[PDB]
């Protein structure tokens, strides 16, 4: 049983991952928080609360970030939570029961970590700024962090950031706040990294969307399919979440690394023999991965 604190930024994948983490027997979410990076805050807060009401177990709260980004995501990607938050499945109950936490995400994270006895695993599928902030303000939290699992970075020649001022070598979660990645990388914590590359072997395919639609009878599968209709014809965050729940889906190669913090290469992650250790996921088992998440969806 792993105690997990989950900070996400409200894309379809972040929200799908919330849904799946809640079906893992092996995981207990101590807290959820939302950062307005790849989302607008209000729909992502709401959708998270409704998913926990609908598909959750214990009583938990969702905290809102008041972090601000250096390099904001494209407005069009950010809209997706409005759609998820509007799905009938998530509105059928006509009530939102799970509470917004009183404290902002970074303070919520601090308070949750320090109030849990056991060390907790941090799962971040958006930028790292709520964590950089928690560290800056209360670095004793190092002692409560088992490890950080983060969707971010790439060690290919080019990333997924194609934006003015940028050289095109960074990945989005890092580019959104390179200074936060730097701070996290100075902290004394173990870091498992799901990079852009890490997901090579599990592309979300039309044959996989169509197999899901065939099993729409399962309400969790129907829900998965409504979520991915919004981004129609890689599951970065889902893979990250799934690696927390089932480490054996993939392998990990320890590399030494730095993050660039300014100029046209800001956000870029670079392997250096001088840098700090980072355990980079590779070699995802296709069949096991997709069998795992459809198993989990069917538990509802």
Ligand X SMILES: OC[C@H]1O[C@H](O)[C@H](O)[C@@H]1O
By rule CB under 6 A, what string of x and - marks binding of each residue 227-266 to ligand X? Answer: ---------xx-----------------------------
Residue 236: which of ligand X, a copy of itself, Ca ion, none does it interact with, CB under 5 to 8 A by kind? Answer: ligand X
The helix (run of H) or strand (run of E) holding residue 289 is helix 286-298
Number of residues that bind Ca ion (CB under 5 A): 6
Q: Is 69 in the site for Ca ion (CB under 5 A)?
A: no
Q: Is 11 in the site for Ca ion (CB under 5 A)?
A: yes
Is 283 annotated to bind a ligand? Reply is no
Alpha-carbon span 177 to 67, nearest angstrom: 10
Q: Which of 4, 5, 6, 13 binds ligand X (CB under 6 A)?
A: 13
Q: Of 116 and 226, which has the nearer Cβ to a copy of itself?
A: 226
Q: Which of residues 73-92 bind ligand X (CB under 6 A)?
A: none
Residue 65: which of ligand X, a copy of itself, Ca ion, none does it interact with, CB under 5 to 8 A by kind? Answer: none
Q: Which of 23, 31, 33, 38 binds ligand X (CB under 6 A)?
A: 38
Q: Which of residues 124-163 bind Ca ion (CB under 5 A)?
A: 125-126
Q: Is 40 in the site for ligand X (CB under 6 A)?
A: no
Q: Please tell me what DSSP assigns to residue 100.
A: B
- DSSP letter string over 115-177? HSSS-EEEEESS-SHHHHHHHHH-GGGGGGEEEEEEE----SS--S---TT--S---HHHHT-
Q: Is 185 in the site for ligand X (CB under 6 A)?
A: no
Residue 172: which of ligand X, a copy of itself, Ca ion, none does it interact with, CB under 5 to 8 A by kind? Answer: ligand X
Nearest approach, Cβ of 209 to a copy of itself (angstroms)? 7
Alpha-carbon span 275 to 191, nearest angstrom: 13
Is 9 annotated to bind a ligand? Reply is yes
- Residue nearest ligand X, CB atom distance: 11
- DSSP letter string over 209-242? HHHHHHTTTSHHHHHHHHHHHTS----HHHHHHH
Distances (CA, A) of 206 to 77, 104, 152, 183, 225: 21, 39, 25, 40, 11
Is 240 annotated to bind a ligand? Reply is no
Q: Please tell me what DSSP assigns to residue 112.
A: H
**Which residues contact a copy of itself (rule: CB under 8 A)?**
43, 76, 82-92, 94, 209-210, 212-214, 216, 221-222, 225-226, 228-230, 232-233
Nearest approach, Cβ of 83 to a copy of itself (angstroms)? 5
Residue 171: which of Ca ion, ligand X, a copy of itself, none does it interact with, CB under 5 to 8 A by kind? Answer: ligand X
By rule CB under 5 A, what string of x and - marks binding of each residue 224-243 to Ca ion? Answer: -------------x------
Q: For residue 281, list its beta bridge partners.
A: 252
166 contacts: CB under 8 Å, gap ≥ 6: 71, 175, 264, 265, 266, 267
Question: What strand order describes the sheet that includes 251-259?
Answer: 62-64, 27-34, 2-8, 120-124, 145-151, 191-194, 276-282, 251-259, 269-271
Give me the residues that bind Ca ion (CB under 5 A), please: 9, 11, 14, 125-126, 237
Binding residues for Ca(2+): 9, 14, 125, 237
Binding residues: 9, 14, 125, 237
């Amino acid at each position: 049983m792993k105690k997990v604190y989950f900070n996400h930024d409200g894309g379809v994948d972040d929200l799908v991952s919330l849904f799946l983490l809640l079906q893992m027997d092996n995981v207990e979410l101590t807290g959820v928080s939302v950062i307005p990076a790849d989302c607008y805050l209000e729909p992502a807060m709401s959708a998270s609360r409704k998913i926990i009401d609908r598909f959750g177990k214990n009583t938990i709260e969702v905290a809102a970030s008041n972090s601000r980004g250096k390099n904001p995501f494209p407005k069009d990607w950010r809209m997706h939570a409005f759609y998820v938050d509007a799905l009938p499945i998530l509105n059928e109950s006509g009530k939102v029961v799970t509470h917004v936490a009183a404290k902002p995400a970074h303070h919520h994270l601090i308070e949750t970590l320090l109030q849990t006895e056991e060390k907790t695993t941090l799962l971040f599928t958006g930028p790292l700024t709520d964590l950089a902030r928690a560290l800056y303000e209360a670095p004793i939290i190092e002692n409560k962090i088992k490890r950080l699992v983060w969707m971010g970075g790439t060690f290919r020649t080019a990333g997924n950031v194609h934006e003015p001022e940028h050289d095109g070598t960074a990945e989005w979660n890092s580019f959104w706040d390179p200074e936060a990645v730097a701070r996290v990388w100075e902290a004394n914590i173990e870091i498992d990294l799901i990079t852009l590359e890490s997901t090579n072997q599990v592309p979300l395919t039309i044959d996989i969307r169509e197999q899901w639609a065939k099993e729409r009878k399962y309400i969790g599968i129907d829900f998965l399919g409504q979520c991915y209709a919004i981004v129609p014809p890689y599951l970065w965050d889902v893979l990250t979440a799934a690696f927390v729940g089932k480490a054996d889906l993939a392998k990990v190669q320890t590399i030494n690394s730095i993050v660039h913090t300014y100029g046209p290469s800001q956000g870029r992650t670079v392997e250096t023999d001088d840098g700090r250790p980072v355990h980079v996921v590779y070699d995802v088992n296709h069949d096991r991965f997709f069998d795992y998440i459809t198993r989990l969806a069917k538990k509802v």
